[PDB]
Design a protein around this ligand. Structure first.
Ligand SMILES: CO[C@@H]1O[C@H](CO)[C@@H](O)[C@H](O)[C@@H]1O
Ligand SMILES: [Fe+3]
Ligand SMILES: [Zn+2]
Ligand SMILES: [Zn+2]
Length: 341
């Protein structure tokens, strides 16, 4: 029984963590850092215990000895009778999204266009699309493919940050945290929605959750699913209803990681925390909901049903899968066995 120290990325996550801390009676406390990489370092030092990470960061964390503990699980069809916490995760679909009005724009004509990315090093926003582009062009100059982009985490003076906007005051341009207007799934989709970019690399869920009244955010309230198309690898364009036949890859779900020596303790505390503040928790929506933050995906994705046990006690490599690990390794050769910190 000790507290678990969660690592929040940026000021907005910090605020949500503080609410969680208060409601949990200090069983969970908060450490804050400006980037995901800095949070990983805090965990390695033992100054923080855990945080929830996209697959691209699990790769970084894994090389440094951190392990997956529990995974985000969202609504599913198969394995219907089984409880959420025990149900296998299905993974999400990485897609490339454009405006219907941008006619004749296909996977094969993306060169020199404007792109919107969740963040550098993330699965749907970066690793998958850039990995595919590097291959198809046979060049490590992915910094040269698009004319301008917003890829949070890149050099703020480079073309890869040209479209990023910063915070209400125009500060923190291109920072890889929610202070940057176009950061993350929602941010990259907004970058496309506002016609700042020509293409957004996000997941299939992002399109649905931010269209047809699903989001009441000022920029999203008038967005219609029909005004968007997905780019398929075969050069065609399809409606967003066809994601199962028109995606770039299937990605492993975001997951909670911790130091191996702390895994058992983190797992215990989190399972109890979700019984109190999760999907149908004792205190949600009454007092506090761990999986809500108004489409902002703070700490956890808003569409998370529960955190699920893994099973087979997988290493980070088995969790990510050989097909994804080799993809990252090859892309990493552009810009092999050691912790990068
Ligand atoms: C997509 O499923 C994954 O496949 C890889 C094989 O690369 C395994 O290591 C892992 O446990 C999972 O079953
Ligand atoms: Fe992701
Ligand atoms: Zn597929
Ligand atoms: Zn194993």
């Amino acid at each position: 029984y000790t507290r678990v120290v969660w690592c929040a990325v940026g000021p907005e996550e910090q605020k949500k963590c503080q609410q969680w801390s208060q409601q949990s009676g200090q069983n969970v406390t908060c450490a804050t850092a400006s980037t995901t990489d800095d949070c990983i370092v805090l965990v390695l030092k033992g100054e923080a215990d855990a945080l929830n990470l996209d697959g691209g960061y699990i790769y970084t964390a894994g090389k440094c000895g951190l392990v997956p503990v529990l995974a985000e699980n969202r609504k599913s069809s198969k394995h219907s009778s089984l409880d959420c916490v025990l149900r296998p995760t299905e993974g999400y679909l990485a897609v490339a999204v454009v405006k219907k009005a941008n006619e004749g724009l296909t996977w094969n004509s993306l060169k020199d266009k404007k792109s919107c990315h969740t963040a550098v090093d993330r699965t749907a926003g970066w690793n998958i699309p850039m990995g595919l582009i590097v291959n198809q062009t046979g060049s490590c100059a992915f910094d040269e493919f698009f004319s301008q982009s917003c890829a949070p985490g890149a050099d703020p003076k480079s073309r890869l940050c040209a479209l990023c906007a910063g915070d209400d005051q125009g500060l923190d341009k291109c920072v890889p945290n929610s202070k940057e207007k176009y950061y993350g799934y929602t941010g990259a989709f907004r970058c496309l929605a506002e016609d700042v970019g020509d293409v957004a690399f996000v997941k299939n869920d992002t399109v649905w959750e931010n269209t047809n009244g699903e989001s009441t955010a000022d920029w999203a309230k008038n967005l219609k699913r029909e005004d968007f198309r997905l780019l398929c690898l075969d050069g065609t364009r399809k409606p967003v209803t066809e994601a199962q036949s028109c995606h770039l890859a299937v990605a492993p779900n975001h997951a909670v990681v911790s130091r191996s020596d702390r895994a058992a303790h983190v797992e215990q505390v989190l399972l109890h925390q979700q019984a109190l503040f999760g999907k149908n928790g004792k205190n949600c929506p009454d007092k506090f909901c761990l999986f809500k933050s108004e489409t902002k995906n703070l700490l956890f994705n808003d569409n998370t049903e529960c955190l699920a046990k893994l099973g087979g006690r997988p290493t980070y490599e088995e969790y990510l899968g050989t097909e994804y690990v080799t993809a990252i390794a090859n892309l990493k050769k552009c810009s092999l066995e050691a912790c990068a910190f």
